Every structure is written in structure tokens, then in C-alpha cells.
């Protein structure tokens, strides 16, 4: 709700 922690913009 605060942040899209599962957002597709993340790298690994």
C-alpha cells in the first residue's frame, strides 16, 4: 500500500 514492493521495475 505504501510502496509497490512487488513492482516489475525491480532488478536482482
Amino acid at each position, epitope marked *: *500500500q*505504501l510502496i509497490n514492493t512487488n513492482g516489475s521495475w*525491480h532488478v536482482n
Partner: antibody
Amino acid sequence: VKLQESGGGLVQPGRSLKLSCAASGFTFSDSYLAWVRQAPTKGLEWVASITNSGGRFYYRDSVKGRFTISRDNAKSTLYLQMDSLRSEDTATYYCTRMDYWGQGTTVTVSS
Amino acid sequence: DIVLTQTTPTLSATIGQSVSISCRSSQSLLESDGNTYLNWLLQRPGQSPQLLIYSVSNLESGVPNRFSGSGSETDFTLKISGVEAEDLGVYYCMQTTHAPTFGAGTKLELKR
């Protein structure tokens, strides 16, 4: 809930600096965290962010390959390794979980 | 790159006046999970940013009731139902549906 940034200071271009953010008052390993910067007189930019357990992270284009976000869950501390610093990197850096923000640490990159 | 446009860079309000700050997105901010990850922040002079509203309309705890948020998929509004002196500063819209971006800010100044 408390967020306290350190490591900021004055450095010449091309030099390195490591920012740290000491957290307290919450389960650190459960929180997603970010570094948000503000250039003097300007607005906010998302620098880098990291999931609760690491594994997934994000760097804005302008800091890719130069900056390294990391966290120590056992020490409740968030880090931002900043290498090859440019004048463009001059800003106050905030450590944040969105609902809570630190007081900031100022970084000045100048010759 | 998602562009968050806050059309009004400055707003002049009187105490007790109702104000609305708009934020327009370049693309839809509706995420695949059904949530719209648009937040509202206030930054008072010399202070760090402070969260007012998260996910379009949710008021953060400790934040006065006079602040409300609404929005579609691309158009968002922060409403201040009766401005107070402590509400003066710069308001920022921000999204995390896509690679995180902020608006350039809207300065809320006092009309005299």
C-alpha cells in the same frame, strides 16, 4: 520509529562516500527501504530502494553502476555506497520507509 | 519514464480556504493487483518530507482529517478542506506502480 542518516560530507568529483541509516522502533527485516535525494532548491528523486530481505532492488538510471544499496538486518542499518561521485550527486539524502523519513544527510560534490 | 505533472507550481490560499492540488500521470497508475500506487507528501520549509496520503485515498495515521485524496487512473487530487498555517509548504505527488517518480511539487503559499 526512528531513521538516522550519517556519512554525508564534502568530496571532490570522482571520489567515494558511504551513507548509512541507523533504524530503531520497528522490525527492520520486515521493511522495504529507499534512498530519496533532494538537490538544493529542487525536488525529490528516488535514488535506490531494496526489499526487506534484499534480493530485489532498484537504482535510477543516473546512479546505475556507481551506487550500491545494501542493508544489515542484524545491525538494523541501511547503506548507500556512492562511487565516482559527480556534481549532479550534490543533494540531501533521505533514508525512508515512506511513512517515516530521516532528517537527511547532506552530500556536496565539488572541486 | 512515467511523468507526474502538477500543473500549478504555486497556490495562494487564505486560512480556512479549501484547496485542491492536481497530479496528472503520463500513463495509468493502476497496477495489476488492483492497487494505484500514488502517494501525497508535504515538505514544510527546512524539514524532511512527510507522508499525507498513500494509495490515492488512504490517510496516513497522525495526519489531520482535512486532507483527502481522490483519483482516477491518470488524474489525482489532494484536497485540503480548510488550509492551516502548518499546511504551508511544498506538496509532492509520487508513484511506485512503475519505476518510482515524483512531481516537481506545488508550493502552497499564504495569500495576504
